[PDB]
Amino acid sequence: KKISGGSVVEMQGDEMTRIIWELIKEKLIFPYVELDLHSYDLGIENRDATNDQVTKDAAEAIKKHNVGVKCATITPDEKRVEEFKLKQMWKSPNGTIRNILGGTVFREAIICKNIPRLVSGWVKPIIIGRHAYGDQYRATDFVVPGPGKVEITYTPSDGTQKVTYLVHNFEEGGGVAMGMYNQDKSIEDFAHSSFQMALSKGWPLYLSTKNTILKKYDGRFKDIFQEIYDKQYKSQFEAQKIWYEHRLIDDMVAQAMKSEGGFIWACKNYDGDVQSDSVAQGYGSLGMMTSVLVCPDGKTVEAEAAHGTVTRHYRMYQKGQETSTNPIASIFAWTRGLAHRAKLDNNKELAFFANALEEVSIETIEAGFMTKDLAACIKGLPNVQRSDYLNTFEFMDKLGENLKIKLAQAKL
Amino acid sequence: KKISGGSVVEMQGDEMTRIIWELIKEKLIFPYVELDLHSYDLGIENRDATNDQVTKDAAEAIKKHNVGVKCATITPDEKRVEEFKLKQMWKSPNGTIRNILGGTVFREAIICKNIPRLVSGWVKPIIIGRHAYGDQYRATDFVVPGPGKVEITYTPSDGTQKVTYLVHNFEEGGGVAMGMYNQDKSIEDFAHSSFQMALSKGWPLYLSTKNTILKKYDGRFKDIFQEIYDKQYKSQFEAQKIWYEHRLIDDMVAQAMKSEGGFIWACKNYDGDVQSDSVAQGYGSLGMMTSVLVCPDGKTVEAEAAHGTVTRHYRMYQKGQETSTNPIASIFAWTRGLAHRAKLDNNKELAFFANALEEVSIETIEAGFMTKDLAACIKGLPNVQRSDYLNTFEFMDKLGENLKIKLAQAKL
Numbered sequence: 006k007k008i009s010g011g012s013v014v015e016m017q018g019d020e021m022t023r024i025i026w027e028l029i030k031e032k033l034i035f036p037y038v039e040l041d042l043h044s045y046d047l048g049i050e051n052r053d054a055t056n057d058q059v060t061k062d063a064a065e066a067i068k069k070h071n072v073g074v075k076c077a078t079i080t081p082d083e084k085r086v087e088e089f090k091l092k093q094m095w096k097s098p099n100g101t102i103r104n105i106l107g108g109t110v111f112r113e114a115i116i117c118k119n120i121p122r123l124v125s126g127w128v129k130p131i132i133i134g135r136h137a138y139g140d141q142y143r144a145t146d147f148v149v150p151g152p153g154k155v156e157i158t159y160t161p162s163d164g165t166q167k168v169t170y171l172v173h174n175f176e177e178g179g180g181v182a183m184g185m186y187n188q189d190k191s192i193e194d195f196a197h198s199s200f201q202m203a204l205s206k207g208w209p210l211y212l213s214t215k216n217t218i219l220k221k222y223d224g225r226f227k228d229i230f231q232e233i234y235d236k237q238y239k240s241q242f243e244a245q246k247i248w249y250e251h252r253l254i255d256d257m258v259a260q261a262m263k264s265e266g267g268f269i270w271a272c273k274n275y276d277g278d279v280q281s282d283s284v285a286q287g288y289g290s291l292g293m294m295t296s297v298l299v300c301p302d303g304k305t306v307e308a309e310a311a312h313g314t315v316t317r318h319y320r321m322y323q324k325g326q327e328t329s330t331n332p333i334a335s336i337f338a339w340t341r342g343l344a345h346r347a348k349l350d351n352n353k354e355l356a357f358f359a360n361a362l363e364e365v366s367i368e369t370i371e372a373g374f375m376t377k378d379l380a381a382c383i384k385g386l387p388n389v390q391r392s393d394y395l396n397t398f399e400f401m402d403k404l405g406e407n408l409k410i411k412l413a414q415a416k417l
Numbered sequence: 418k419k420i421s422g423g424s425v426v427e428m429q430g431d432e433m434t435r436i437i438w439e440l441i442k443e444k445l446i447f448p449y450v451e452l453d454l455h456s457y458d459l460g461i462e463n464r465d466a467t468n469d470q471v472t473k474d475a476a477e478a479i480k481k482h483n484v485g486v487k488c489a490t491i492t493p494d495e496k497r498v499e500e501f502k503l504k505q506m507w508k509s510p511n512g513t514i515r516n517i518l519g520g521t522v523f524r525e526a527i528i529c530k531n532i533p534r535l536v537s538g539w540v541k542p543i544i545i546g547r548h549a550y551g552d553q554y555r556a557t558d559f560v561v562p563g564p565g566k567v568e569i570t571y572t573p574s575d576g577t578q579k580v581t582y583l584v585h586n587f588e589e590g591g592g593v594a595m596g597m598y599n600q601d602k603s604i605e606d607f608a609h610s611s612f613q614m615a616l617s618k619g620w621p622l623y624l625s626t627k628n629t630i631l632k633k634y635d636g637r638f639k640d641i642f643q644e645i646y647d648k649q650y651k652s653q654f655e656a657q658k659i660w661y662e663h664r665l666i667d668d669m670v671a672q673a674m675k676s677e678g679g680f681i682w683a684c685k686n687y688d689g690d691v692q693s694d695s696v697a698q699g700y701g702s703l704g705m706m707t708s709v710l711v712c713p714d715g716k717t718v719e720a721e722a723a724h725g726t727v728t729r730h731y732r733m734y735q736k737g738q739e740t741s742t743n744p745i746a747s748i749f750a751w752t753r754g755l756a757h758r759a760k761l762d763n764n765k766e767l768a769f770f771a772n773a774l775e776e777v778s779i780e781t782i783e784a785g786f787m788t789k790d791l792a793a794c795i796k797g798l799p800n801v802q803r804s805d806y807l808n809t810f811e812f813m814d815k816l817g818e819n820l821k822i823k824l825a826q827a828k829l
């Protein structure tokens with residue numbers, strides 16, 4: 006019989022990723038796993054039709070059932086409003102879900118021995134976590150049109166003495182100014198997620214800051230992480246022969262690049278961005294990275310591919326043209342989700358399945374069966390021949406055949 | 418007779434780079450060029466002995482003579498303080514020089530046809546530099562001890578308006594808050610350095626901004642660069658068949674990835690995250706990148722290798738073990754410095770020399786004579802045989818022999 010997988014929240018998306026998402030379910034998941042599936046259609050037409058209520062209901066379902074797996078979705082701009090005749094320029098469903106759940110966004114690459122990367126020596130992923138403070142977390146920047154003083158004041162709730170700090174007195178010309186903040190509770194949540202991620206993986210954790218420039222602001226992150234480590238995690242880390250260390254951002258980047266990988270990196274940046282850094286995009290654009298939101302309760306996770314809907318491929322698909330879209334990141338959104346479900350329910354069979362599907366995916370690519378973009382990584386796009394890659398459907402078929410063999414081997 | 422090279426500020430450094438720096442001068446520079454050499458010993462023992470006065474004097478000399486060439490130096494940490502029994506944990510000489518001169522740092526790769534790169538199609542360097550305020554910049558950050566409102570106000574000098582922006586109302590606990598600013602003059606300086614770098618190279622310039630969180634900050638950089646281009650550089654650029662364009666980071670990364678290179682990339686800074694400028698320095702670990710500080714004046718230049726003192730190789734050298742340290746980046750700090758000196762003085766003979774030394778260096782590697790790290794790039798470190806590379810001294814000897822032949826050919 007099939008594995009009884011339990012309660013999973015699944016969010017359907019848009020364009021090419023919507024096609025691949027259905028292929029993953031029909032070919033890799035449903036033949037082996039039975040789910041109490043809480044399925045939400047976050048397709049742009051359905052979000053428009055429901056006045057974005059579907060997104061809010063999907064976020065509430067993840068909060069209730071603790072496991073969410075999300076397909077890439079269209080974030081509307083002026084062009085999308087005209088394309089689909091939208092009622093409004095709906096907000097990013099990622100942003101809406103992230104604001105409702107809160108938590109730390111961790112980014113993890115899928116590594117294949119034959120697939121080039123920035124550093125040859127990187128053999129284990131470098132998991133970078135950025136805390137989501139929200140879109141209710143208002144960054145306060147403005148133009149200073151001309152001379153005058155910019156001041157920042159703190160007024161205690163208890164009526165006690167107001168404190169005023171001079172940011173700058175613009176004596177000639179103008180510029181720009183900004184105000185930023187972080188609550189201690191948000192730093193504490195970021196710390197807990199980071200320490201638990203490091204223990205979960207059995208890897209060391211590094212926190213990077215600019216505490217040389219932001220002595221009080223970044224110093225608070227450094228002190229809170231250190232206090233939490235000393236009081237709640239030091240014993241556990243020493244027992245796994247791992248450690249926690251703070252690093253300045255410049256030292257951390259240089260050290261990571263001379264590393265073999267295999268560490269957690271809690272990244273405290275200035276603007277509170279949670280998106281991948283610029284250079285990670287050269288690898289995320291391959292369909293080889295996931296984004297996992299780890300919520301402050303230590304029970305709720307939301308997993309998704311770290312790429313968009315692949316519009317360019319969807320247009321080819323709409324014209325009946327052959328496509329070669331990499332489903333790896335979307336598959337790993339499912340496996341990372343299912344592995345978390347297995348951990349919460351102590352479901353050994355589901356935990357085995359999720360790990361086996363990850364192994365099958367990496368092994369298929371490593372055996373030389375891959376989509377066009379991966380073949381172009383190895384050979385160079387001008388040198389790629391049709392015999393070097395598999396189309397979307399052929400690649401999914403190969404994964405399905407390989408998964409069947411793998412699960413048969415597991416029986417004996 | 419030798420070339421009369423003029424006034425150059427030279428800073429001696431530490432460990433393996435100090436050995437190579439003397440070899441460069443004795444074998445590649447001094448047999449051909451006579452200099453009014455302003456030489457400063459920035460060796461860690463001398464900085465300690467002079468209470469870092471030597472560093473400040475070397476920075477003043479660069480300001481006066483416009484051309485500086487710097488050897489890699491030790492930046493002290495707790496371990497270095499113990500190693501050399503230092504009086505203080507002296508500040509980075511780079512930081513001290515940068516604070517005194519001002520300007521923007523640009524990274525420039527040295528490219529060899531047989532040396533693999535991140536993108537195969539990169540045949541000309543992508544000269545990347547980011548905005549950065551000096552150490553003089555004081556951020557207004559503070560602890561928020563408990564609940565209360567944090568607000569940032571702008572009061573124009575003419576007393577007619579007052580704009581108050583709510584940063585955050587801390588309802589539950591305290592945290593941290595900051596006020597930050599950018600003066601228009603600082604953005605203008607970054608723009609001028611970038612436009613002058615593009616004209617100096619005869620290449621187009623691109624400015625990148627994120628435009629996702631601090632849009633008014635990003636917008637000010639975009640407007641200032643465009644205004645400066647239209648009013649002071651557009652004619653000069655059109656005359657050199659080059660151009661200036663603004664691009665969003667994501668578009669810039671994708672474009673750079675499909676480019677052949679040969680452009681200036683000025684990055685708006687996003688401190689605390691993994692920046693393209695810090696990532697670029699990883700190519701410097703091969704000894705194949707320089708860092709050039711360019712002041713907005715267009716007259717003052719400080720050049721250095723984009724790597725450190727190579728301590729690991731220095732320890733081998735101390736034990737009498739064979740080393741293979743790449744001197745290319747240190748040689749290009751000299752040639753980039755000497756080429757700038759030649760431009761300021763209209764010295765055709767010095768300009769020929771600097772370019773000939775750059776050609777000799779690239780040609781030697783391309784003919785298959787290189788250090789171990791470059792041989793490992795091509796073949797993979799486990800497959801490198803002793804016959805695939807030259808040790809430090811053998812490589813310098815080959816460059817010296819090749820330079821002698823090249824300059825003899827130039828005469829006849």
Ligand SMILES: NC(=O)c1ccc[n+]([C@@H]2O[C@H](COP(=O)([O-])OP(=O)(O)OC[C@H]3O[C@@H](n4cnc5c(N)ncnc54)[C@H](OP(=O)(O)O)[C@@H]3O)[C@@H](O)[C@H]2O)c1
Nearest residue numbers: 077078079080290291292312313314315316317330331378
């Ligand atoms: N997480 C999300 O929900 C999410 C994230 C980002 C963007 N978006 C949405 O995505 C839509 C389209 O964005 P976009 O096309 O600019 O970005 P994108 O879908 O990530 O695609 C950019 C390019 O990267 C390549 N690529 C990305 N993922 C790939 C994969 N799985 N397999 C193969 N190639 C892959 C393709 O390159 P080539 O064209 O060279 O083949 C593609 O055209 C937008 O409407 C945006 O709102 C959603």
Ligand SMILES: NC(=O)c1ccc[n+]([C@@H]2O[C@H](COP(=O)([O-])OP(=O)(O)OC[C@H]3O[C@@H](n4cnc5c(N)ncnc54)[C@H](OP(=O)(O)O)[C@@H]3O)[C@@H](O)[C@H]2O)c1
Nearest residue numbers: 489490491492702703704724725726727728729742743790
């Ligand atoms: N601009 C500067 O003055 C500057 C910049 C950075 C660091 N530093 C100082 O440099 C010292 C050493 O720092 P570090 O060892 O972390 O950094 P590093 O000197 O850049 O060396 C790191 C590694 O990069 C490789 N490498 C760098 N340059 C090389 C070259 N020319 N040829 C061959 N291999 C090269 C070597 O890798 P392998 O180990 O695999 O052989 C080396 O061990 C420290 O005291 C630091 O403060 C100064």
Ligand SMILES: C[C@@H]1CN(C(=O)c2ccc[nH]2)Cc2c(C(=O)Nc3cccc([C@@H](C)O)c3)nn(Cc3ccc(F)cc3)c21
Nearest residue numbers: 114116121122123127130131258261262284285287288691
């Ligand atoms: C560390 C994360 C995630 N990854 C991994 O963990 C990984 C993959 C395989 C083994 N490990 C990949 C990766 C890459 C990457 O490969 N960029 C890339 C860019 C252009 C062209 C190409 C082509 C060759 O594919 C690649 N960059 N970053 C951002 C980063 C960089 C420097 C830091 F210090 C910090 C963050 C990352």
Ligand SMILES: C[C@@H]1CN(C(=O)c2ccc[nH]2)Cc2c(C(=O)Nc3cccc([C@@H](C)O)c3)nn(Cc3ccc(F)cc3)c21
Nearest residue numbers: 123262526534535539542543670673674693696697699700
């Ligand atoms: C573009 C700039 C400057 N470059 C050049 O111009 C260049 C070099 C050769 C010909 N041209 C090099 C470079 C590098 C680079 O090579 N980093 C690196 C890091 C670790 C380890 C290694 C090697 C040892 O494995 C390399 N990264 N960036 C940042 C970037 C990357 C991808 C983007 F899409 C956008 C920004 C850059």
